[PDB]
Amino acid sequence: IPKQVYLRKRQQLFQLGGRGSEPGSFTWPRGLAVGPDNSIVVADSSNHRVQVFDSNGIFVKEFGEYGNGEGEFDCLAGVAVNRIGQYIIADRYNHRIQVLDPQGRFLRAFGSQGTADGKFNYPWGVTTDALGFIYVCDKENHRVQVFQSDGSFVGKFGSCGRGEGQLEHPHYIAVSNTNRVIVSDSNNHRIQIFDVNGKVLSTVGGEGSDDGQFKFPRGVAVDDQGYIFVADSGNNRIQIFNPDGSFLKTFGSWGSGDSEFKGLEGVAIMSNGNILVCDRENHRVQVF
C-alpha cells in the first residue's frame, strides 16, 4: 500500500555514482527519470551525457557528448522518458529540447535561445503526459511551455512574480494522471499546481524548514495515484505529500553519508515505490 511504503522511507537501499567520467560515474548529475522496466535514467550534466542503469543501479548504456550538434549536449538538466520509450532531454546551454529513440538515437531537436513561443532561456525540467505532450520548465522565461511530441508549439503559462500563477526560477516539473502540471517554483519556495490549460489549481508549501515548508525546492515527481515527491534542496531532504497536497513524510538531512544529501536535483519514482534522488554535490543517485 503506497501510503505505508512511503511512511517507511528513510534508509537508502543503494546508491550509484561517484565523481568521474567513466561509465557509472557522474559529475554534477541533475535530472533523473524512470524508464521502461524501472530503469534509472540520469542526466550526467557535466559529462554532457545521459546514463541508463537497470533497476539495481547497474550500468546499461549511455549516449551524448559535448557540443551543439545532433545528439550532442551542453550541460543538460532535465530528462524524461515518454510512453513509447523515447528520451526527452532539456539541453540547457543549447536552449533546446532533444528527442532520442529508445536506443538513444537522435530523432529531433526543437527550440533555440530567446523569448518567442518555442524559444527558451535555459530549459531545465522536462516531462511528458499520457498522450506524449512535452512540458518544459523554461527557467529564465519564468514559464512552462507545452509541445506536441514532434516539438510543435501548443501553449504556455506562467510569468515572473510571487503571485498566483507566477513563477520565479522554476526548475522541475511533473504531470499527474489527473492532468495536473506540478511545478517547483524554486525562488518562491513553493510548488505550484496548474491544469494542462494553464489555470492555477493550488499551491503547496511556502518558505521555511518545518514539515510542508520548502527552501529552494528542485526535483518534483508524482506517482500513479497522485502522491507528490519534492527534493527540498535548501533543507537537504525529500518531502512526500498526499495527492490532496497535505504533508505525509520527510526524510534526509545534510551530509555525504548514507541517507544524507548535500545538493538535491532531480527526483523520480519507480513502479514499486522506490524513490530515486539525485544528490548533485555528492555526485550520486540514492534509491530509497
Side-chain angles (χ1 to χ4, degrees), residues 1-2 5-9 11-60 62-82 84-163 165-196 198 200-214 216-288:
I1 304 299
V5 170
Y6 300 146
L7 286 168
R8 289 167 179 170
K9 298 294 183 197
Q11 162 72 260
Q12 81 191 40
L13 293 171
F14 62 88
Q15 65 177 51
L16 53 156
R19 183 172 173 180
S21 72
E22 295 179 293
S25 295
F26 305 130
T27 306
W28 297 294
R30 295 197 191 258
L32 194 52
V34 174
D37 203 17
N38 283 327
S39 61
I40 299 171
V41 179
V42 184
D44 185 12
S45 308
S46 293
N47 290 321
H48 313 288
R49 68 184 172 176
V50 173
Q51 297 190 68
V52 181
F53 305 80
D54 72 16
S55 57
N56 292 319
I58 311 303
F59 178 87
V60 169
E62 68 181 281
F63 51 85
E65 66 192 70
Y66 174 74
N68 63 17
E70 295 182 339
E72 299 181 338
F73 306 121
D74 190 350
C75 291
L76 68 161
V79 61
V81 184
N82 75 7
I84 54 164
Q86 297 175 331
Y87 297 91
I88 319 299
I89 283 75
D91 191 5
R92 178 187 169 197
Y93 283 150
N94 291 319
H95 306 274
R96 67 185 176 178
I97 305 306
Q98 297 192 59
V99 182
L100 304 101
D101 81 4
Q103 319 308 333
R105 193 187 190 83
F106 170 91
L107 295 175
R108 66 181 68 89
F110 60 95
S112 60
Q113 188 266 317
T115 56
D117 293 351
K119 292 193 182 181
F120 306 104
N121 276 305
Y122 308 99
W124 202 287
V126 63
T127 195
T128 72
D129 69 15
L131 298 180
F133 291 96
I134 298 169
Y135 301 72
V136 179
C137 284
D138 183 3
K139 181 175 78 78
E140 285 306 306
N141 290 332
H142 309 294
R143 68 191 182 181
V144 174
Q145 295 193 69
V146 186
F147 303 85
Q148 297 183 43
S149 68
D150 75 345
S152 298
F153 181 78
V154 173
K156 66 182 186 288
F157 51 92
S159 56
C160 63
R162 191 164 279 186
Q166 293 173 328
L167 301 166
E168 285 289 343
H169 294 227
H171 283 76
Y172 292 94
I173 187 165
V175 179
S176 67
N177 274 325
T178 55
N179 287 308
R180 297 174 179 192
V181 182
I182 302 152
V183 179
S184 60
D185 186 8
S186 306
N187 277 12
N188 291 326
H189 310 295
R190 67 189 181 181
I191 267 58
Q192 283 211 290
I193 304 184
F194 299 86
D195 56 43
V196 288
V200 176
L201 299 175
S202 69
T203 300
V204 177
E207 182 177 351
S209 63
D210 298 319
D211 290 349
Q213 301 181 318
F214 306 118
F216 299 110
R218 292 251 162 156
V220 292
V222 67
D223 81 1
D224 283 328
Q225 294 178 273
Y227 288 88
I228 300 170
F229 305 80
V230 181
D232 182 10
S233 304
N235 288 316
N236 301 289
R237 67 188 177 175
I238 298 306
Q239 296 194 63
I240 310 176
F241 297 84
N242 299 299
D244 66 10
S246 63
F247 174 83
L248 182 63
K249 171 75 170 184
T250 187
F251 63 94
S253 55
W254 183 82
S256 54
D258 267 12
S259 313
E260 303 176 327
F261 307 124
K262 283 190 178 181
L264 292 177
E265 288 282 1
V267 66
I269 183 70
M270 288 181 182
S271 68
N272 57 18
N274 287 357
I275 301 167
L276 308 56
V277 180
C278 179
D279 187 13
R280 183 205 63 254
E281 209 58 46
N282 290 312
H283 305 281
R284 66 180 172 181
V285 170
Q286 296 148 279
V287 185
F288 296 86

